[model samples]
Target chain A: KLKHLDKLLAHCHRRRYTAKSTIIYAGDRCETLFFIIKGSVTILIEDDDGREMIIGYLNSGDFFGELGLFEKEGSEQERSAWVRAKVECEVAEISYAKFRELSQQDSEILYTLGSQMADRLRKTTRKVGDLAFLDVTGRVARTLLDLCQQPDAMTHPDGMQIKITRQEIGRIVGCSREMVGRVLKSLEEQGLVHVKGKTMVVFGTR
Target chain B: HLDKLLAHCHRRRYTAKSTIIYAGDRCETLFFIIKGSVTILIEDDDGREMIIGYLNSGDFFGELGLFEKEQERSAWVRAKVECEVAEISYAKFRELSQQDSEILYTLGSQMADRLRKTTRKVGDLAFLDVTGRVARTLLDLCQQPDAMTHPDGMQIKITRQEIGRIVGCSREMVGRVLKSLEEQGLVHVKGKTMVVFGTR
Candidate 1:
């Protein structure tokens, strides 16, 4: 039986955040991993010049900063990539150093975390390849797919709630805000996607 | 054997100022440079042409797009000088990747490394000024760190156009900047090469 789950939750720092708080900062080295336990969180990243790019929104149960735990065994040269949490939320925090020490006492925790980290790495690798090869529409479809657990839209009543701004989306894709806005509107006009409030739903058109 | 494969390859020659592949084209061919130099340009939404890279001599181009089965070419490739390159068909390339696991892994790893390099470059382009980009590019591409001396000296083998493309500038601009670096004794440029100033 997994015993450390309770200990992880118990010793974990729990704090409430109001809307629009920078939950994670880009560029800085993060020591802790976060598990979203309550509310929602947005992930924002920045270019080298500090131009903020919003990656996505995360609801409860969505994991963040788990990649930090993967770096425990790496040499200094292999430790450059960084990820940030974007919006207000509550997270279960575990420091990398502590996690490493904990893994010695608990083998299952290490195995579970390593497997999850590997899955995250695979997803990221696919995303990077898509960004390098696919057009805007393809990337948008991939993003929508990530946001919605169900590939087809029949499972959920309303589509995924993407509480991100056009400018932020533009930053994430390395494009202009107007371009991002126009692309969304174009998709709607083409009947591939529809937007209501802040939510975006993609219905495979006939 | 590679040369025989090259014989089956399609050959195209372009004069200077010709656009070989436009951005958003469904590029299915992997380009192998045989002679001359080419510049790859990436344009922003506002039509701002950001010269992303340049390929010259024995360099294989578009290895990522073909290997990943990407639908389109992401950048505009042009002949900086009169250039000739061989294009390998996607079908043959895909067959190679499928048949050979080690080769496919090598291709995938190289693409991943290239992405990491590009990510770093984009960050540098966003943060660093032209001179800083130039300095950093020279350091990364040319100078292998020499640790014997108290002060480290770096040298790079790059042409003006190549440097310009890496830093997103024109060759003329790179030449002018190199002249400035020369005046400051920050760099020394011979015929077509450069040696950067010492780093402490």
Candidate 2:
């Protein structure tokens, strides 16, 4: 997917980020661009009270922080979210200064970053539409549907399931931990979901 | 600061409440607001609509639709008033931005902010009800690019139903809250315009 990063990051070296750690913080100046050389990371935004809503995840070959590179004016751009390593990750990094040089020589880099950000915006807008249209039950159901499409979801004869927690679901679905639990119980009775500790399976949800 | 981008766009004008672009239209050109405001609308399968955001002069839209592989406009955009905009075709902007690349920086920063707002909107809908969200919308309206400064405070030209579209509530519900707000003196509702000034 990262046609430009495939070639650009080939010679770039790496840095280590421990699993479950914050790699980027919201409000910090977006000074550097990041390339995922290995492993994955989740991008998230938070309310002032500190509840996190994950925007999405990025796998190896995905690039980030180019948004800063695009901040060609003003007091520099602040990061919009917290990007956390989903696992121990090897990442390639470059400053905005260096990226300007890179873009100057290779115009494809700008096109690649612009198109990828468009893809990110598309997903975020869909998430917003879900919130506007769906009730809590529907939101949780769709979140389950979304989770099942991720790489970690296991497809079984019965249904597709993913390793997840009610707390995490609350974060994803914009509910309290208790609300997610209650919805799970409600959906279970409806024959739409089967939930155990830290994992959930769902049918087609017809 | 925007002259490089502005120099590329052809001018167009719209009457108040005119539809600018509909969802699923081919995204062949980018639009830059020169002297107007527009509302971005999203509709669900049942046809319920939500006003996701507003943009005015100094802002832009259709970049995602124009720049991305998927060339479909994601939402219905309508003129908020009789206003003017600059339109640039894909081929025109492609050559300009490819030559300058600084424009990509501008587009990137904006995308970051739009993503943040959309994410925040989700969280806000989760926690707030119709009245609270309506009031919040008024507070945000005061800060929008086109909001005018008056003798009392900040004022905006918007209808009850437009605010409802923003909060995903009914026109009646928004009117109910406006009644409460005006009674409480946080807002002065005059005709179709709302002016926000504190009076405790």
Candidate 3:
């Protein structure tokens, strides 16, 4: 424990959650900032029509619900998306007001949050461009590549294995499950990937 | 006065469709839009382009590269109209922003605003269809439900192909959508200029 985080840690509370449990929902007022301690999180936005769009995934040490930092003091803004645990996970949360208090005393915290926001913003922008311009095949390939880039991705004997269903992949890539299956089959035929059970192994130069 | 920035910064003019910055180009300077509009976009290897968004006057376009040093240009910026821009060297910009807290705050808030827009764009791309995207883009540009009316409808000078690029569809699809919109009495097209009626 660093000196700067002493106050923050005192205000932080840890909790455990099971897989598929929604940590936050859209339209809920911002209250706390969550830091992942263990397991994975999937951030998604559900449209008015009830279509869910996966924005990105977060790993341990990553923090979210940071739009709270931009809110005015004592102001309440509803969250624009849902955050869910992809697996049994542990998270530490500090209230929005307390985080802001710590931020005022620690420039490092503010800078870290700002940079993370910028990075995620750029990634989201690129995803929008990909969705608009890339073909279904290209989108699937890019998503696989992105999965492989994650630090904790499982490496298999054949290649990198990602524990994601075709339906989940479809949601992430903004395509139909059938389309994802077709693309995966095509890729398997091309010897670029292989699917066994629920795990898909990506083999490439990426 | 900041108006005196004309002397220090490189002032450049670009005609419609002229490339201001190409993807993969080395980042050096940040651009500030002075007049007209520019579209930041990315073109795939197959020559298909996706329009990210459009920036108008009093906007900044190339700060991302400055924020992350040693990175190449991530996208292309093309002039949507004859545009005037001021280019500030990254070093100079960094110095100024660090020296003036007010300038730094302005830049930070502007960046945050853009991040929100990009996040919203991602949601639209994932959840909305071509028709929905086109409608949303129109509302974004018009800014008001009643911004368009009888004799004084807002004139948007953009081509069908560009609209197609923005909505991620073929130009023919764009033409069809425009025809449908006109049929619904929502918009009117005269050559390159499109006049919007009402959201209804």
* lDDT string, candidate 1, A136-202, tens digits: 6555656655655522223434344444455655665656767677888987797666766555665
Q: Which DockQ-derived CAPRI band holds candidate 1?
A: incorrect
lDDT of 2 by residue, A1-206 (tens): 45655556755658899989889988788778898888889888875466777667887767876665544356676776788998789999877777777777776787777777877777777777787667788988888888778766788677887777888788877779998999999988988889878778887722
Give the lDDT ranking, best first. 2, 3, 1
lDDT of 3 at B24: 89
Q: Candidate 1 — which residues are off by over 4 angstroms?
A: A1-4, A27-31, A55-59, A62-88, A95-98, A150-164, B1-200
Q: Of the candidates shown, which would achieve the greatest TM-score relative to the real structure?
A: 2
Clashing pairs in 3: none
| The 10-residue segment with the lowest total lDDT in model 1 chain A | A71-80
Which sequence of candidate numbers ranks them by TM-score, best first? 2, 3, 1
**DockQ score of candidate 2?**
0.51
Structural similarity to truth (TM-score) of each candidate: 0.48, 0.82, 0.76
DockQ of 3: 0.33
Residue range B1-200, candidate 1, lDDT tens digits:
25755676789898998988876778678777799988766753434355555668766666545523145666678899998888888788655434333333333333334444554544444324566667667666643543122233555566887776566566776788888878988778887656666754
The clash numbers for all candidates, in the given order, read 2, 1, 0
Candidate 1 residue-wise lDDT at B160:
82
